[PDB]
Amino acid sequence: ITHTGQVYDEKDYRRVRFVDRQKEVNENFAIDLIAQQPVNEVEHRIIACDGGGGALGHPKVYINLDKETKTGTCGYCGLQFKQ
Amino acid sequence: FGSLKDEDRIFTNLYGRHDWRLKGALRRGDWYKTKEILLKGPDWILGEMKTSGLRGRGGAGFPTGLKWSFMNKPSDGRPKYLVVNADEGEPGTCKDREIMRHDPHKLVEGCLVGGRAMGARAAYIYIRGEFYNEASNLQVAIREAYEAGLIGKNACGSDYDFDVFVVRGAGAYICGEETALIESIEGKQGKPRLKPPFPADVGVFGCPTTVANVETVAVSPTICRRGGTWFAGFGRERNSGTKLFNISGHVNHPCTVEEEMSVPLKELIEKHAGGVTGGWDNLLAVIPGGSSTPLIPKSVCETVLMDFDALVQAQTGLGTAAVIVMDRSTDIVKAIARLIEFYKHESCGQCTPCREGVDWMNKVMARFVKGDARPAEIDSLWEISKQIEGHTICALGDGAAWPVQGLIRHFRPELEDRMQRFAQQH
Amino acid sequence: DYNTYTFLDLNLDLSKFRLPQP
Amino acid sequence: VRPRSDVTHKQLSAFGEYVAEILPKYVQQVQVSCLDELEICIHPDGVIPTLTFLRDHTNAQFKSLADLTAVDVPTRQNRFEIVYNLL
Amino acid sequence: SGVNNTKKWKMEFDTRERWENPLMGWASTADPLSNMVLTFSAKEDAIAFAEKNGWSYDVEEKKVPKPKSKSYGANFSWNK
Amino acid sequence: FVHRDTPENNPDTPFDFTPENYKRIEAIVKNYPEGHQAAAVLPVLDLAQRQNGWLPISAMNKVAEVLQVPPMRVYEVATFYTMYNRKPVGKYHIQVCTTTPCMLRDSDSILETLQRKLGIKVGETTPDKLFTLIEVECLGACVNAPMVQINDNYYEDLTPKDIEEIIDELKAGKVPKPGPRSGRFCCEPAGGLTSLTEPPKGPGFGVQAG
Amino acid sequence: SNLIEVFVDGQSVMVEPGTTVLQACEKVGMQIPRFCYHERLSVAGNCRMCLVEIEKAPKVVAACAMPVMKGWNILTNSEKSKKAREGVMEFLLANHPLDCPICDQGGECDLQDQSMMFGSDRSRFLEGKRAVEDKNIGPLVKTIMTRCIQCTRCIRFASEIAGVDDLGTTGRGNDMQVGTYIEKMFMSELSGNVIDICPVGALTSKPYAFTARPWETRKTESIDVMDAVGSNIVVSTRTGEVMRILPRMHEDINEEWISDKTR
Amino acid sequence: PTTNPPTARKFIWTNHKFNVSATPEQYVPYSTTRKKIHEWVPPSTPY
Amino acid sequence: PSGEERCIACKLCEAICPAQAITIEAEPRADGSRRTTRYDIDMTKCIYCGFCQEACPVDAIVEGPNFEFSTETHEELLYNKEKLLNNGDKWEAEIAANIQADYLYR
Ligand SMILES: Cc1cc2nc3c(=O)[nH]c(=O)nc-3n(C[C@H](O)[C@H](O)[C@H](O)COP(=O)(O)O)c2cc1C
Ligand code: SF4
Ligand code: SF4
Ligand code: SF4
Ligand code: FES
Ligand code: FES
Ligand SMILES: [Zn+2]
């Protein structure tokens, strides 16, 4: 159910906690939300993902998009870029 | 002073004009007293070198005699060796390309004359692979010599047995370095070693070894023939003998001519070679020893003379004595910038200070040519420059820092204006 | 004019002269 | 880097010697930190005597007790290090 | 490769139960002397602390790296 | 510097020294001290290139076996030096020297001339694969500043036009008089010898006794 | 006999002839900041982060590689030997990708600490950085090699401690990347030690990728039971489940190394 | 908010809720980590 | 903005929390990305210092404007990743405006 497949077993009693209450979960899951964003087709071997917004984003990092097969993915945003 | 006589010059075959092959060499009488000299013994030969006062002739001008002497210590059961670097990579150096191509023999007897001085079992000549044709010339010459019996067992009538080999370089400036020539000879990657295990002590293949600029090996037979005194007389004090001078760039007749070392610079371009293109007044700067040495601006040139002592007083190095001249028609900021590009495309990357430092100066230098960088950045490069100068495993990082230091030292106002020019147009 | 193997083949020719190995 | 006046490190140092001389039966070590603070160290028996001299001496009146504390160095045989700070 | 944490002796009490907490899954411990590690400068002083406090002790001798001979020349040995 | 196996450039391309080449390899090994065959890596690897300009990963592997050296070692040497292609290369493979000495004597012009002459941009090769243009660094021969190394030859002291002439010679026919296509002989003073004007000396001259 | 006396800041330590300058400082107790020098790996001199200043000498010397000589005073903390570290650390950091909150050698970094202790507080590298394509060296070691400080301890271990002789340097300049030229996995026992021996977090462990962070890990010293060498090991436990087993040094049994199986 | 509206980011809620504490919508804390020590389930086939 | 949670589990928000409130355990997500399996701020333990706001490199954990979250039961005050992420989604518009106003100062 949750982001990590956290689902109390059919016999676990913490399910009593959810009795007469809502088990809080978020419909918007990141694993999926990042996928939607398309691969950025940059034209330089190495590009940088400042995180969007500079100081309001994530530490700046340079990605090597040299591997033709795969696409570079910022360890921070998850945004992907291909040459 | 200067004005060496052609008669007292060493490579008469310079500029060709005489068969680089043996016959022409016999008329030159290059192989005249070789048997006798070797018969004299290792010590006597090395002694003549000391008397000569001959310095390096290659990159750093270490006293040749003392250096070679370091392997005149008794053999410890490992064959001693001779390595004659002919990489000739320092930008501006065609100095060596001559002896190798024009007068291969002089170097062949230089090798055996030098060999008995160090008691080397054999000599390997690392001519840069770029010069394939050059190689063709020397082993033809080496083949002639053995056919004659001048080299090999029973070398020139001497019980001394010396074998000379030629090794292919593969387009690396660093291969030139003394510890790195060895590793290329050893077959590993061309990465210099640290000096604590000195080259004589740990040799190639763990056998004592010594490395000489081809010019240094070539003059040893003629210096023994002419005697240290004759040679030592030509130079000024510590700086001695006559060193070939290669003048390239912004000069009317660029050429390599050998002249009395300690020859005034304003004169070198004036008497041999040719006048500074556009008049001596059109001299923005000159780099006396090649790319590694700092360039000196014109004020100093009129006064400075080409000898290593005088240059170190001037803060520049005689080095390979390659004179590169820059008229007032050149963007020095870009001239030196390509030399830093020359060093980023070439340093081995073994040591942290050169690897990142030379790349760091390249990035800053490219911005400096554009003028994008602010004025405060200029003194930073200075600080980046000396971090690289004293911390590097080899001298190339030493060499990369000096041109940067020269540009800031004498042309700081021009770089500031390029700084200013870009800021104004926004 | 020289061939691609000039250096190597010339050397092989010199092998006979080459003094004995260490 | 903090500004340091050596006037104090000299004044306090001298006083340290003065105290030590006057109370040599108990003062073991007298040091001035690099922070210009004196720290006479006394044998436990000198608790009464050293304090009293400081509370009632014309050339060293130390009327109020800022604090009494005890660091505990377990390694040290004498575990506690009673420290009395006076003004 | 720093050795500044291998200098002072430490005596550490034996590890005890760390059961998972049902409501949040946080680790839960019933042993008070667990997180306590006292630092003593010398082996003799630490042994003393155990004896007077009455805790059982099992001292482990310090093991320091043995001297190792190194020299850059070796790597370029004729025959290694 | 990563060899991602490709059908063309990968060991499926079998490599083996022609019988003659192997003979050459043997001599090369003889020069070095016995027990130090590994030292012949550079020379042997070059021979491989002579055989096949591409010098594919398979070739590197063969070199290793021939010299009984770890495969990685061959790779290090190949990826370190620059005279090794490690890819397919043009029949002519011209290289233009662009260090400051040459540039100061207008090397850039030559490169530009070639770019359009060749019709190919630097770092690239012609469609017929006849010519590959590379901006190489100091190739020595600085005195004859304007200079380029076509294949093994060193064409020197060239004015833009001269190259076009040379390239044409290469494009139709062969052996286009490789060398400095200028009036000067080698690296002499262009106008006239500043020295070495007089005849050379003779054996024994000014020789100290013995 | 065989006991030169060298002074480390005037402490007259005495060392067997042959001891390096770094080793001389160790017996006094001082520790030269070092990268690319491991006790049981050959001296290489790649980093030059250990430059010290022997007294009355023009240039600073390489600690890990300089045979000490009689009389020398090391001046390890000399204003000079601090510029010789304040300026090297400038370089290692310049091409470094700042993903320290990705680098799971977060608190286990000999490059942040040697930077927080022996280096400067800021940066002047206003230029751009570099990036090196990663490599799938294996299923145990995750090589995010854009982190590599080209210290060549891997290439040594992979040749000297283990006889793999596969890892090697490829190229020259600032794009010397120390990864297998062709993609051949580093398959050997003793493989996981590369993780422990790379001070940078370029190549680290793939199973223990992001499960923890070292300050939290409670470290209990125990014995290897997978094999009969009985190698000493430290089991790093967080909140009661083991997170990592890494080696702890036993001169006689496992001297800083453990098998691929038992970690 | 009318004058300068806020940035919309295609995850932000459109119906914001008040304190749901007394109502059954309330957060009930739970560990989101999965099991750690999986166990050997016996063999269901009689030996 | 894309929808990928900012936290990359560097876990120094846990390191600098004065009260030991934040508990983080992580594992590489299927995507291969670094993410926190469990992020639990115990608000009763938290003393609202705001250092976590300070420490985060990606600034994933922020001190949100709402002060009215009084709860009938003690368990509700303990917050897991889902409540905080939901709290983040609800107040993101104002949090973004607040960080926008104060980032130059920091
Ligand atoms: C980066 C670098 C490149 C060098 N290139 C050459 C060269 O091309 N030719 C040369 O003779 N020496 C060169 N040297 C100097 C050699 O390392 C060595 O000092 C010299 O060849 C010794 O010869 P000598 O005793 O005749 O001076 C170079 C040094 C460095 C650091
Ligand atoms: S290695 Fe990992 S941790 Fe150490 S500095 Fe580089 S990134 Fe930060
Ligand atoms: S990988 Fe680790 S060890 Fe191998 S070089 Fe890069 S940093 Fe040094
Ligand atoms: S919250 Fe900020 S700091 Fe705490 S882990 Fe996630 S990212 Fe690192
Ligand atoms: S620079 Fe082109 S010849 Fe040396
Ligand atoms: S430790 Fe001194 S060179 Fe790296
Ligand atoms: Zn990103």
mmCIF file with all atom_site columns, N, CA, C and O in Angstrom, chain B residues 125-136 139 166-171 175 184-185, chain C residues 4 7-8, chain F residues 28 32 42-44 46 50 81 83-84 149 152:
data_model
loop_
_atom_site.group_PDB
_atom_site.id
_atom_site.type_symbol
_atom_site.label_atom_id
_atom_site.label_alt_id
_atom_site.label_comp_id
_atom_site.label_asym_id
_atom_site.label_entity_id
_atom_site.label_seq_id
_atom_site.pdbx_PDB_ins_code
_atom_site.Cartn_x
_atom_site.Cartn_y
_atom_site.Cartn_z
_atom_site.occupancy
_atom_site.B_iso_or_equiv
_atom_site.pdbx_formal_charge
_atom_site.auth_seq_id
_atom_site.auth_comp_id
_atom_site.auth_asym_id
_atom_site.auth_atom_id
_atom_site.pdbx_PDB_model_num
ATOM 1   N N  . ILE B 1 125 ? 68.214 4.389  -27.298 1.00 0.00 ? 125 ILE B N  1
ATOM 2   C CA . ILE B 1 125 ? 67.918 5.787  -27.725 1.00 0.00 ? 125 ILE B CA 1
ATOM 3   C C  . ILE B 1 125 ? 66.408 5.905  -27.928 1.00 0.00 ? 125 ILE B C  1
ATOM 4   O O  . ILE B 1 125 ? 65.892 5.243  -28.838 1.00 0.00 ? 125 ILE B O  1
ATOM 5   N N  . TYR B 1 126 ? 65.734 6.742  -27.138 1.00 0.00 ? 126 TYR B N  1
ATOM 6   C CA . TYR B 1 126 ? 64.256 6.856  -27.234 1.00 0.00 ? 126 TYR B CA 1
ATOM 7   C C  . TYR B 1 126 ? 63.972 8.065  -28.124 1.00 0.00 ? 126 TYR B C  1
ATOM 8   O O  . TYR B 1 126 ? 63.837 9.178  -27.586 1.00 0.00 ? 126 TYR B O  1
ATOM 9   N N  . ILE B 1 127 ? 63.876 7.837  -29.425 1.00 0.00 ? 127 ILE B N  1
ATOM 10  C CA . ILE B 1 127 ? 63.510 8.901  -30.333 1.00 0.00 ? 127 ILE B CA 1
ATOM 11  C C  . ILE B 1 127 ? 61.998 8.922  -30.325 1.00 0.00 ? 127 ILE B C  1
ATOM 12  O O  . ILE B 1 127 ? 61.359 7.876  -30.293 1.00 0.00 ? 127 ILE B O  1
ATOM 13  N N  . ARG B 1 128 ? 61.413 10.107 -30.323 1.00 0.00 ? 128 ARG B N  1
ATOM 14  C CA . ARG B 1 128 ? 59.972 10.199 -30.259 1.00 0.00 ? 128 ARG B CA 1
ATOM 15  C C  . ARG B 1 128 ? 59.371 9.470  -31.444 1.00 0.00 ? 128 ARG B C  1
ATOM 16  O O  . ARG B 1 128 ? 59.861 9.589  -32.561 1.00 0.00 ? 128 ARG B O  1
ATOM 17  N N  . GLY B 1 129 ? 58.303 8.716  -31.203 1.00 0.00 ? 129 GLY B N  1
ATOM 18  C CA . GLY B 1 129 ? 57.672 7.955  -32.266 1.00 0.00 ? 129 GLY B CA 1
ATOM 19  C C  . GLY B 1 129 ? 57.197 8.828  -33.402 1.00 0.00 ? 129 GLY B C  1
ATOM 20  O O  . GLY B 1 129 ? 57.153 8.395  -34.552 1.00 0.00 ? 129 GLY B O  1
ATOM 21  N N  . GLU B 1 130 ? 56.841 10.063 -33.087 1.00 0.00 ? 130 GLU B N  1
ATOM 22  C CA . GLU B 1 130 ? 56.421 10.984 -34.121 1.00 0.00 ? 130 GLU B CA 1
ATOM 23  C C  . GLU B 1 130 ? 57.440 10.976 -35.232 1.00 0.00 ? 130 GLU B C  1
ATOM 24  O O  . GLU B 1 130 ? 57.096 10.879 -36.405 1.00 0.00 ? 130 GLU B O  1
ATOM 25  N N  . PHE B 1 131 ? 58.709 11.053 -34.863 1.00 0.00 ? 131 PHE B N  1
ATOM 26  C CA . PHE B 1 131 ? 59.758 11.020 -35.854 1.00 0.00 ? 131 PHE B CA 1
ATOM 27  C C  . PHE B 1 131 ? 59.996 9.601  -36.312 1.00 0.00 ? 131 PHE B C  1
ATOM 28  O O  . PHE B 1 131 ? 60.882 8.951  -35.802 1.00 0.00 ? 131 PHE B O  1
ATOM 29  N N  . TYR B 1 132 ? 59.202 9.091  -37.244 1.00 0.00 ? 132 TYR B N  1
ATOM 30  C CA . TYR B 1 132 ? 59.475 7.757  -37.778 1.00 0.00 ? 132 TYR B CA 1
ATOM 31  C C  . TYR B 1 132 ? 60.616 7.845  -38.766 1.00 0.00 ? 132 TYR B C  1
ATOM 32  O O  . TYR B 1 132 ? 61.526 7.022  -38.753 1.00 0.00 ? 132 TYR B O  1
ATOM 33  N N  . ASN B 1 133 ? 60.574 8.856  -39.621 1.00 0.00 ? 133 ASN B N  1
ATOM 34  C CA . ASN B 1 133 ? 61.618 9.033  -40.612 1.00 0.00 ? 133 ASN B CA 1
ATOM 35  C C  . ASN B 1 133 ? 62.955 9.244  -39.928 1.00 0.00 ? 133 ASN B C  1
ATOM 36  O O  . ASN B 1 133 ? 63.976 8.732  -40.377 1.00 0.00 ? 133 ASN B O  1
ATOM 37  N N  . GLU B 1 134 ? 62.955 9.994  -38.836 1.00 0.00 ? 134 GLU B N  1
ATOM 38  C CA . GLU B 1 134 ? 64.191 10.231 -38.114 1.00 0.00 ? 134 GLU B CA 1
ATOM 39  C C  . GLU B 1 134 ? 64.798 8.914  -37.683 1.00 0.00 ? 134 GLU B C  1
ATOM 40  O O  . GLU B 1 134 ? 66.010 8.725  -37.780 1.00 0.00 ? 134 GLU B O  1
ATOM 41  N N  . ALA B 1 135 ? 63.960 7.999  -37.208 1.00 0.00 ? 135 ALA B N  1
ATOM 42  C CA . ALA B 1 135 ? 64.444 6.698  -36.758 1.00 0.00 ? 135 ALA B CA 1
ATOM 43  C C  . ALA B 1 135 ? 65.085 5.975  -37.909 1.00 0.00 ? 135 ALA B C  1
ATOM 44  O O  . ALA B 1 135 ? 66.163 5.396  -37.775 1.00 0.00 ? 135 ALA B O  1
ATOM 45  N N  . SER B 1 136 ? 64.422 6.006  -39.051 1.00 0.00 ? 136 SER B N  1
ATOM 46  C CA . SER B 1 136 ? 65.003 5.390  -40.222 1.00 0.00 ? 136 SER B CA 1
ATOM 47  C C  . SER B 1 136 ? 66.445 5.834  -40.388 1.00 0.00 ? 136 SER B C  1
ATOM 48  O O  . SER B 1 136 ? 67.297 5.028  -40.756 1.00 0.00 ? 136 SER B O  1
ATOM 49  N N  . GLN B 1 139 ? 69.282 4.210  -37.252 1.00 0.00 ? 139 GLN B N  1
ATOM 50  C CA . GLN B 1 139 ? 69.628 2.761  -37.234 1.00 0.00 ? 139 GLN B CA 1
ATOM 51  C C  . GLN B 1 139 ? 70.372 2.327  -38.548 1.00 0.00 ? 139 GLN B C  1
ATOM 52  O O  . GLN B 1 139 ? 71.202 1.400  -38.542 1.00 0.00 ? 139 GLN B O  1
ATOM 53  N N  . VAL B 1 166 ? 67.516 1.483  -30.568 1.00 0.00 ? 166 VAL B N  1
ATOM 54  C CA . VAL B 1 166 ? 66.595 2.648  -30.718 1.00 0.00 ? 166 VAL B CA 1
ATOM 55  C C  . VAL B 1 166 ? 65.202 2.217  -30.257 1.00 0.00 ? 166 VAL B C  1
ATOM 56  O O  . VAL B 1 166 ? 64.724 1.166  -30.725 1.00 0.00 ? 166 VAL B O  1
ATOM 57  N N  . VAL B 1 167 ? 64.580 2.996  -29.367 1.00 0.00 ? 167 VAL B N  1
ATOM 58  C CA . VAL B 1 167 ? 63.217 2.668  -28.858 1.00 0.00 ? 167 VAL B CA 1
ATOM 59  C C  . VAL B 1 167 ? 62.123 3.613  -29.355 1.00 0.00 ? 167 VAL B C  1
ATOM 60  O O  . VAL B 1 167 ? 62.341 4.833  -29.324 1.00 0.00 ? 167 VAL B O  1
ATOM 61  N N  . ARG B 1 168 ? 61.003 3.059  -29.815 1.00 0.00 ? 168 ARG B N  1
ATOM 62  C CA . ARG B 1 168 ? 59.910 3.953  -30.312 1.00 0.00 ? 168 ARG B CA 1
ATOM 63  C C  . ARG B 1 168 ? 59.111 4.725  -29.275 1.00 0.00 ? 168 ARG B C  1
ATOM 64  O O  . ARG B 1 168 ? 58.595 4.071  -28.349 1.00 0.00 ? 168 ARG B O  1
ATOM 65  N N  . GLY B 1 169 ? 59.068 6.057  -29.373 1.00 0.00 ? 169 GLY B N  1
ATOM 66  C CA . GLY B 1 169 ? 58.309 6.875  -28.411 1.00 0.00 ? 169 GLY B CA 1
ATOM 67  C C  . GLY B 1 169 ? 56.874 6.799  -28.880 1.00 0.00 ? 169 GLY B C  1
ATOM 68  O O  . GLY B 1 169 ? 56.655 6.294  -29.993 1.00 0.00 ? 169 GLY B O  1
ATOM 69  N N  . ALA B 1 170 ? 55.908 7.215  -28.061 1.00 0.00 ? 170 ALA B N  1
ATOM 70  C CA . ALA B 1 170 ? 54.534 7.227  -28.604 1.00 0.00 ? 170 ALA B CA 1
ATOM 71  C C  . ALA B 1 170 ? 53.836 8.562  -28.331 1.00 0.00 ? 170 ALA B C  1
ATOM 72  O O  . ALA B 1 170 ? 52.843 8.565  -27.588 1.00 0.00 ? 170 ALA B O  1
ATOM 73  N N  . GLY B 1 171 ? 54.331 9.650  -28.929 1.00 0.00 ? 171 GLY B N  1
ATOM 74  C CA . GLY B 1 171 ? 53.654 10.959 -28.822 1.00 0.00 ? 171 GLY B CA 1
ATOM 75  C C  . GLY B 1 171 ? 53.384 11.435 -27.405 1.00 0.00 ? 171 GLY B C  1
ATOM 76  O O  . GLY B 1 171 ? 52.273 11.952 -27.177 1.00 0.00 ? 171 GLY B O  1
ATOM 77  N N  . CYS B 1 175 ? 56.996 11.479 -21.629 1.00 0.00 ? 175 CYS B N  1
ATOM 78  C CA . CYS B 1 175 ? 57.901 10.371 -21.820 1.00 0.00 ? 175 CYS B CA 1
ATOM 79  C C  . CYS B 1 175 ? 59.289 10.927 -21.676 1.00 0.00 ? 175 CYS B C  1
ATOM 80  O O  . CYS B 1 175 ? 60.186 10.262 -21.184 1.00 0.00 ? 175 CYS B O  1
ATOM 81  N N  . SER B 1 184 ? 58.636 3.993  -19.802 1.00 0.00 ? 184 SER B N  1
ATOM 82  C CA . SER B 1 184 ? 58.251 3.675  -21.200 1.00 0.00 ? 184 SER B CA 1
ATOM 83  C C  . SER B 1 184 ? 59.209 2.597  -21.711 1.00 0.00 ? 184 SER B C  1
ATOM 84  O O  . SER B 1 184 ? 58.728 1.639  -22.340 1.00 0.00 ? 184 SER B O  1
ATOM 85  N N  . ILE B 1 185 ? 60.508 2.755  -21.456 1.00 0.00 ? 185 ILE B N  1
ATOM 86  C CA . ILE B 1 185 ? 61.499 1.713  -21.863 1.00 0.00 ? 185 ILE B CA 1
ATOM 87  C C  . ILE B 1 185 ? 61.089 0.407  -21.181 1.00 0.00 ? 185 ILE B C  1
ATOM 88  O O  . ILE B 1 185 ? 61.078 -0.617 -21.862 1.00 0.00 ? 185 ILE B O  1
ATOM 89  N N  . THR C 2 4   ? 56.645 1.304  -43.817 1.00 0.00 ? 4   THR C N  1
ATOM 90  C CA . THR C 2 4   ? 56.141 1.234  -42.447 1.00 0.00 ? 4   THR C CA 1
ATOM 91  C C  . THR C 2 4   ? 56.957 0.310  -41.565 1.00 0.00 ? 4   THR C C  1
ATOM 92  O O  . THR C 2 4   ? 56.971 0.466  -40.348 1.00 0.00 ? 4   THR C O  1
ATOM 93  N N  . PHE C 2 7   ? 61.785 0.704  -39.705 1.00 0.00 ? 7   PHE C N  1
ATOM 94  C CA . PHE C 2 7   ? 62.389 0.696  -38.379 1.00 0.00 ? 7   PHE C CA 1
ATOM 95  C C  . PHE C 2 7   ? 62.507 -0.704 -37.817 1.00 0.00 ? 7   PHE C C  1
ATOM 96  O O  . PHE C 2 7   ? 63.568 -1.093 -37.334 1.00 0.00 ? 7   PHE C O  1
ATOM 97  N N  . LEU C 2 8   ? 61.423 -1.466 -37.867 1.00 0.00 ? 8   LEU C N  1
ATOM 98  C CA . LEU C 2 8   ? 61.440 -2.798 -37.276 1.00 0.00 ? 8   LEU C CA 1
ATOM 99  C C  . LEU C 2 8   ? 62.305 -3.770 -38.054 1.00 0.00 ? 8   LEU C C  1
ATOM 100 O O  . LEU C 2 8   ? 63.138 -4.466 -37.479 1.00 0.00 ? 8   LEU C O  1
ATOM 101 N N  . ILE F 3 28  ? 62.206 -7.506 -31.713 1.00 0.00 ? 28  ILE F N  1
ATOM 102 C CA . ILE F 3 28  ? 61.912 -6.449 -30.771 1.00 0.00 ? 28  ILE F CA 1
ATOM 103 C C  . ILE F 3 28  ? 62.161 -6.952 -29.372 1.00 0.00 ? 28  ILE F C  1
ATOM 104 O O  . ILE F 3 28  ? 62.753 -6.258 -28.556 1.00 0.00 ? 28  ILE F O  1
ATOM 105 N N  . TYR F 3 32  ? 65.404 -5.908 -25.647 1.00 0.00 ? 32  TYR F N  1
ATOM 106 C CA . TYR F 3 32  ? 65.282 -5.783 -24.209 1.00 0.00 ? 32  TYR F CA 1
ATOM 107 C C  . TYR F 3 32  ? 65.960 -6.940 -23.494 1.00 0.00 ? 32  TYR F C  1
ATOM 108 O O  . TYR F 3 32  ? 66.187 -7.989 -24.086 1.00 0.00 ? 32  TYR F O  1
ATOM 109 N N  . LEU F 3 42  ? 55.089 -1.393 -26.086 1.00 0.00 ? 42  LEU F N  1
ATOM 110 C CA . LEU F 3 42  ? 54.900 -0.284 -27.002 1.00 0.00 ? 42  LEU F CA 1
ATOM 111 C C  . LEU F 3 42  ? 55.347 -0.664 -28.401 1.00 0.00 ? 42  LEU F C  1
ATOM 112 O O  . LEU F 3 42  ? 54.598 -0.495 -29.356 1.00 0.00 ? 42  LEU F O  1
ATOM 113 N N  . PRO F 3 43  ? 56.558 -1.202 -28.535 1.00 0.00 ? 43  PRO F N  1
ATOM 114 C CA . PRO F 3 43  ? 56.957 -1.488 -29.909 1.00 0.00 ? 43  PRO F CA 1
ATOM 115 C C  . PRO F 3 43  ? 55.996 -2.456 -30.581 1.00 0.00 ? 43  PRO F C  1
ATOM 116 O O  . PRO F 3 43  ? 55.586 -2.216 -31.715 1.00 0.00 ? 43  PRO F O  1
ATOM 117 N N  . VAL F 3 44  ? 55.628 -3.528 -29.895 1.00 0.00 ? 44  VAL F N  1
ATOM 118 C CA . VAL F 3 44  ? 54.759 -4.532 -30.493 1.00 0.00 ? 44  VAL F CA 1
ATOM 119 C C  . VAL F 3 44  ? 53.389 -3.971 -30.804 1.00 0.00 ? 44  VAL F C  1
ATOM 120 O O  . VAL F 3 44  ? 52.842 -4.221 -31.873 1.00 0.00 ? 44  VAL F O  1
ATOM 121 N N  . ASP F 3 46  ? 52.614 -1.072 -31.547 1.00 0.00 ? 46  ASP F N  1
ATOM 122 C CA . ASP F 3 46  ? 52.735 -0.262 -32.736 1.00 0.00 ? 46  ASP F CA 1
ATOM 123 C C  . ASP F 3 46  ? 52.697 -1.137 -33.962 1.00 0.00 ? 46  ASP F C  1
ATOM 124 O O  . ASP F 3 46  ? 52.041 -0.810 -34.943 1.00 0.00 ? 46  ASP F O  1
ATOM 125 N N  . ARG F 3 50  ? 50.496 -0.993 -37.304 1.00 0.00 ? 50  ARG F N  1
ATOM 126 C CA . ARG F 3 50  ? 51.014 -1.032 -38.657 1.00 0.00 ? 50  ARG F CA 1
ATOM 127 C C  . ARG F 3 50  ? 50.217 -2.043 -39.443 1.00 0.00 ? 50  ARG F C  1
ATOM 128 O O  . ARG F 3 50  ? 49.830 -1.788 -40.578 1.00 0.00 ? 50  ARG F O  1
ATOM 129 N N  . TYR F 3 81  ? 49.185 6.727  -24.304 1.00 0.00 ? 81  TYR F N  1
ATOM 130 C CA . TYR F 3 81  ? 49.871 7.421  -25.367 1.00 0.00 ? 81  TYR F CA 1
ATOM 131 C C  . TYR F 3 81  ? 48.858 7.844  -26.395 1.00 0.00 ? 81  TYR F C  1
ATOM 132 O O  . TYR F 3 81  ? 47.707 7.445  -26.312 1.00 0.00 ? 81  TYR F O  1
ATOM 133 N N  . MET F 3 83  ? 49.677 8.196  -30.042 1.00 0.00 ? 83  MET F N  1
ATOM 134 C CA . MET F 3 83  ? 49.962 7.780  -31.403 1.00 0.00 ? 83  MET F CA 1
ATOM 135 C C  . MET F 3 83  ? 49.212 6.500  -31.729 1.00 0.00 ? 83  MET F C  1
ATOM 136 O O  . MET F 3 83  ? 49.191 6.077  -32.879 1.00 0.00 ? 83  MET F O  1
ATOM 137 N N  . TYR F 3 84  ? 48.575 5.890  -30.735 1.00 0.00 ? 84  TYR F N  1
ATOM 138 C CA . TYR F 3 84  ? 47.771 4.696  -30.974 1.00 0.00 ? 84  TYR F CA 1
ATOM 139 C C  . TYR F 3 84  ? 46.350 5.110  -31.293 1.00 0.00 ? 84  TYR F C  1
ATOM 140 O O  . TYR F 3 84  ? 45.745 5.843  -30.518 1.00 0.00 ? 84  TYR F O  1
ATOM 141 N N  . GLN F 3 149 ? 51.729 16.623 -40.029 1.00 0.00 ? 149 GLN F N  1
ATOM 142 C CA . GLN F 3 149 ? 52.246 15.280 -40.220 1.00 0.00 ? 149 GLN F CA 1
ATOM 143 C C  . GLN F 3 149 ? 51.217 14.409 -40.900 1.00 0.00 ? 149 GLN F C  1
ATOM 144 O O  . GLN F 3 149 ? 50.300 13.908 -40.258 1.00 0.00 ? 149 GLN F O  1
ATOM 145 N N  . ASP F 3 152 ? 53.051 9.210  -41.697 1.00 0.00 ? 152 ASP F N  1
ATOM 146 C CA . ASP F 3 152 ? 54.348 9.220  -41.040 1.00 0.00 ? 152 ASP F CA 1
ATOM 147 C C  . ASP F 3 152 ? 55.202 10.384 -41.488 1.00 0.00 ? 152 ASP F C  1
ATOM 148 O O  . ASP F 3 152 ? 56.068 10.841 -40.748 1.00 0.00 ? 152 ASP F O  1
#
